[PDB]
Amino acid sequence: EEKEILWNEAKAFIAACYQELGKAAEVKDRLADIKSEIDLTGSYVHTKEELEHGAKMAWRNSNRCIGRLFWNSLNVIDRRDVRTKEEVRDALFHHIETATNNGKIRPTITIFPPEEKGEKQVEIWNHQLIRYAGYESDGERIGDPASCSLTAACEELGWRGERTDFDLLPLIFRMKGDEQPVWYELPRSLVIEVPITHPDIEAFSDLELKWYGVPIISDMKLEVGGIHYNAAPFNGWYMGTEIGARNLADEKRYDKLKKVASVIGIAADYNTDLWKDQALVELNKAVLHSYKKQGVSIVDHHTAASQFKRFEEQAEEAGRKLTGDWTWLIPPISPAATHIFHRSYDNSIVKPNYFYQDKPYE
Amino acid sequence: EEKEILWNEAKAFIAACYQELGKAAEVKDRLADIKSEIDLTGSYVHTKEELEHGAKMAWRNSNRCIGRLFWNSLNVIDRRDVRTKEEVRDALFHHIETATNNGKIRPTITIFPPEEKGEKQVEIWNHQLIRYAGYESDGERIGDPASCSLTAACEELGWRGERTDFDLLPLIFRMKGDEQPVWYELPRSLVIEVPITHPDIEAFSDLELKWYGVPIISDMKLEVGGIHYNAAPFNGWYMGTEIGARNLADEKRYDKLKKVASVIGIAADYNTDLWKDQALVELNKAVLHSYKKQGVSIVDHHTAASQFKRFEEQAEEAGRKLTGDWTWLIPPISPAATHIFHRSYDNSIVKPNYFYQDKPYE
Numbered sequence: 001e002e003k004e005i006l007w008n009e010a011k012a013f014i015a016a017c018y019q020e021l022g023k024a025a026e027v028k029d030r031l032a033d034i035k036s037e038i039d040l041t042g043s044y045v046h047t048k049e050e051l052e053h054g055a056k057m058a059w060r061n062s063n064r065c066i067g068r069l070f071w072n073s074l075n076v077i078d079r080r081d082v083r084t085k086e087e088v089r090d091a092l093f094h095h096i097e098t099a100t101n102n103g104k105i106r107p108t109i110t111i112f113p114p115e116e117k118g119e120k121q122v123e124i125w126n127h128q129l130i131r132y133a134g135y136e137s138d139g140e141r142i143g144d145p146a147s148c149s150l151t152a153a154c155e156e157l158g159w160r161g162e163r164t165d166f167d168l169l170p171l172i173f174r175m176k177g178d179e180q181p182v183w184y185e186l187p188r189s190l191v192i193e194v195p196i197t198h199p200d201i202e203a204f205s206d207l208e209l210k211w212y213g214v215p216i217i218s219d220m221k222l223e224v225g226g227i228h229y230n231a232a233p234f235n236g237w238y239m240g241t242e243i244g245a246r247n248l249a250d251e252k253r254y255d256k257l258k259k260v261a262s263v264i265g266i267a268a269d270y271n272t273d274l275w276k277d278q279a280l281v282e283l284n285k286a287v288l289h290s291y292k293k294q295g296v297s298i299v300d301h302h303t304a305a306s307q308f309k310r311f312e313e314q315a316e317e318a319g320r321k322l323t324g325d326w327t328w329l330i331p332p333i334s335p336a337a338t339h340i341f342h343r344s345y346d347n348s349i350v351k352p353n354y355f356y357q358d359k360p361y362e
Numbered sequence: 363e364e365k366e367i368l369w370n371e372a373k374a375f376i377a378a379c380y381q382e383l384g385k386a387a388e389v390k391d392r393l394a395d396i397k398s399e400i401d402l403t404g405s406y407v408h409t410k411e412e413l414e415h416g417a418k419m420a421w422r423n424s425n426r427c428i429g430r431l432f433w434n435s436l437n438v439i440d441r442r443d444v445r446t447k448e449e450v451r452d453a454l455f456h457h458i459e460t461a462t463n464n465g466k467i468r469p470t471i472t473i474f475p476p477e478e479k480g481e482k483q484v485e486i487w488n489h490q491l492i493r494y495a496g497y498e499s500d501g502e503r504i505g506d507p508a509s510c511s512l513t514a515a516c517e518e519l520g521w522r523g524e525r526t527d528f529d530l531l532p533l534i535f536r537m538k539g540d541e542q543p544v545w546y547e548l549p550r551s552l553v554i555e556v557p558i559t560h561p562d563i564e565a566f567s568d569l570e571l572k573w574y575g576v577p578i579i580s581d582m583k584l585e586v587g588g589i590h591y592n593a594a595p596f597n598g599w600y601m602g603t604e605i606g607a608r609n610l611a612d613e614k615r616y617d618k619l620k621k622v623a624s625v626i627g628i629a630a631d632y633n634t635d636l637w638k639d640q641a642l643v644e645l646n647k648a649v650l651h652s653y654k655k656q657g658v659s660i661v662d663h664h665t666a667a668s669q670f671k672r673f674e675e676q677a678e679e680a681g682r683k684l685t686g687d688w689t690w691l692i693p694p695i696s697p698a699a700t701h702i703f704h705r706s707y708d709n710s711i712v713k714p715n716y717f718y719q720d721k722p723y724e
């Protein structure tokens with residue numbers, strides 16, 4: 001009965017995947033073998049090629065992603081073999097090292113064993129493999145509020161943060177069978193961080209801002225042909241606005257705009273001065289400059305939008321329908337200056353794809 | 363059979379309107395009289411109170427409008443009495459003068475006689491009562507491209523523009539019965555314009571930019587209780603971004619960003635410099651400064667969003683459902699710095715409301 005759903009999702013997926021791979025003739029016999037595998041086992045196992053291509057399609061179908069031009073160059077690491085928490089740990093460490101690539105970031109995904117009966121083999125608690133802790137107590141606020149609750153959950157497990165504004169959270173995950181997750185401190189040698197400086201306002205370094213090099217999302221499920229890879233962390237490189245216009249700017253995040261206005265020498269008293277907008281622009285210029293100066297990959301929202309226009313053009317030529325979420329595709333800074341703002345996008349969900357799933361805590 | 367639609371729209375409208383006006387008891391007898399009026403005549407006529415309140419509700423229900431906090435102070439001018447093109451003209455002139463109010467702008471609407479059988483009594487061709495002409499020929503581009511086609515249609519009627527970048531289009535409209543519209547040159551004494559200067563970059567005036575004081579939208583239909591007021595031009599004051607981030611910035615409008623970058627002393631060579639964003643911010647600061655210096659009403663996107671937050675709060679207290687179009691409500695500059703960006707809005711259409719209708723030409 002769920003053997004049903006799996007089979008249909010498998011037919012749809014294998015047909016399209018083998019088609020795109022020029023292997024249309026092998027569809028029939030591969031489906032045959034799958035049809036039997038589901039019967040006996042209650043599931044089927046992807047070939048390395050299907051799994052690599054599915055992860056690529058899934059990125060291609062991510063409506064909210066402006067970076068999709070490069071879907072076909074995704075570096076897929078197949079780690080369906082892992083059985084131990086040491087192996088998971090070492091896999092997660094490797095992912096960080098290989099994706100980082102000394103600053104020249106490789107979009108990469110590491111794929112762990114999929115859910116069995118909706119039962120997770122590996123359950124990752126981090127939202128990104130590399131994220132900063134957040135604390136709030138007695139009015140006091142330190143670090144990244146977005147991480148307050150995961151931070152409290154790590155501190156239930158005998159971890160303790162130093163309470164700087166940029167404590168690296170440990171990796172934390174649970175193995176099937178275990179009642180509590182384990183946690184491992186990140187080796188600082190693996191984590192590139194970028195101090196934020198401004199191209200020509202030297203006082204900007206007084207803010208003592210920094211951010212980490214690589215956003216590695218670890219809380220989404222990759223679904224491919226009815227197989228549910230709940231643990232499959234992936235990374236791109238940052239678009240500068242994500243850091244400069246949100247992580248560092250939002251009132252519910254680091255909330256730095258007033259501090260930025262002060263070091264850039266402008267008043268923060270009157271809305272009509274547009275001081276927040278000016279602060280946002282200088283902060284965002286600073287972030288791109290710092291990543292570039294440090295030789296860590298990053299893209300500005302204008303170039304990103306240009307690439308996405310190429311993605312739109314490439315999709316039409318291949319005869320693929322384009323889907324997209326206008327509300328996430330527009331950048332949070334000068335959106336009307338990108339072509340994205342001035343057109344609309346069909347927000348339909350096509351599979352394979354990445355999906356939200358609930359965290360264990362919270 | 364359309365006597366049907368009219369009656370239902372009339373019941374819905376009178377019930378809600380009289381309710382909001384504390385006149386619930388008068389609903390039954392007023393409906394009675396309407397029920398008979400439709401029977402005999404094929405339509406019904408609004409009282410002055412219903413028409414004023416309907417126009418106010420219609421603004422309140424405009425999902426794309428961030429300025430709705432002030433819906434209840436709309437100044438409604440009832441001009442259902444007009445029968446001649448001289449009267450229409452003089453009504454349109456008055457609207458400009460009274461809405462402008464020497465710079466202290468009054469949100470106003472002038473309401474002309476409604477459609478009879480879907481037949482317009484008065485058919486206004488302008489998109490705004492005050493707009494700039496646009497020309498394109500032999501690669502050459504002058505004025506406001508948004509106005510290219512209306513401009514060509516006026517020049518079919520024996521008008522001729524001087525071909526500056528800021529020619530005022532004439533008022534142009536057609537009376538039921540007439541085959542061609544008539545046109546009337548706007549008296550310059552009625553039209554306030556604002557030269558764009560920057561608070562502290564004196565070279566900014568070399569761009570020789572200006573814009574008109576009052577946006578008076580003349581192409582939407584006001585619908586109230588099944589009555590279709592195709593001619594009912596209305597105005598607010600500008601939000602600075604409409605001028606600085608769109609009318610003057612869009613490549614398909616005045617396309618000034620490169621020129622702005624030059625006078626503000628920054629390079630326009632590299633996306634990573636975020637020169638468009640910086641140009642956008644200085645251009646927008648300039649617009650707000652110029653309107654304020656000239657004593658012409660204007661609002662910045664931050665204050666506007668704050669007012670709209672108050673509108674949201676006021677709607678909840680009155681037990682009214684809020685509707686809104688997130689994609690138009692977010693400003694095109696620093697949208698993530700307003701609360702609007704971070705919540706969602708039900709885009710349902712509630713009546714009374716303003717609607718798009720086709721232009722005669724094009």
Ligand code: HEM
Pocket residue numbers: 055059062064065066067068070074107108109234235236237238239242299304328354
């Ligand atoms: C290579 C550089 C990449 C860039 C610059 C990029 C850029 C972005 C941005 C800016 C967002 C929106 C975040 C926001 O507005 O808050 C996003 C969303 C997303 N991206 Fe990408 N991306 C890249 C690579 C990838 C990769 C490799 C994948 C997966 C294989 C991916 C999948 C997604 C998904 C699933 C979302 C939506 C997440 C959600 O719903 O919360 N992207 N991307």
Ligand code: HEM
Pocket residue numbers: 417421424426427428429430432436469470471596597598599600601604661666690716
């Ligand atoms: C008092 C100051 C006002 C301000 C600042 C204001 C602001 C705005 C803005 C910024 C937009 C969106 C334009 C865009 O994003 O391109 C808008 C849309 C709109 N406003 Fe207002 N508004 C005001 C008054 C009014 C009035 C008096 C009415 C009618 C009685 C009105 C009805 C609308 C409508 C119908 C739209 C949508 C038009 C469309 O769909 O094209 N507003 N308003």
Ligand SMILES: CNCc1ccccc1OCc1ccc2ccc(N)nc2c1
Pocket residue numbers: 127128215217218219220235236237238239242356
């Ligand atoms: C469940 N959402 C996952 C998530 C957790 C923590 C931060 C952002 C997230 O999603 C937004 C998102 C997702 C994938 C991205 C890939 C690359 C990139 N530069 N930004 C990206 C941004």
Ligand SMILES: CNCc1ccccc1OCc1ccc2ccc(N)nc2c1
Pocket residue numbers: 489490577579580581582597598599600601604718
């Ligand atoms: C059919 N759309 C009408 C229209 C024609 C020409 C310019 C803008 C328009 O609609 C957007 C619009 C509508 C009403 C507004 C009222 C006040 C204001 N400051 N901006 C406003 C902007």
Ligand SMILES: C[C@H](O)[C@H](O)[C@H]1CNc2nc(N)[nH]c(=O)c2N1
Pocket residue numbers: 341342343344689690691692
């Ligand atoms: C239809 C499509 O979403 C279109 O490009 C919209 C985008 N959002 C907008 N938002 C505003 N404020 N004004 C516009 O003219 C548009 N155009």
Ligand SMILES: C[C@H](O)[C@H](O)[C@H]1CNc2nc(N)[nH]c(=O)c2N1
Pocket residue numbers: 327328329330703704705706
């Ligand atoms: C659900 C609601 O639209 C929400 O505020 C969205 C708005 N658009 C967004 N767009 C981006 N890029 N990132 C976000 O986190 C959000 N949040």
Ligand SMILES: [Cl-]
Pocket residue numbers: 215242247
């Ligand atoms: Cl992030």
Ligand SMILES: [Cl-]
Pocket residue numbers: 577604609
């Ligand atoms: Cl306008």
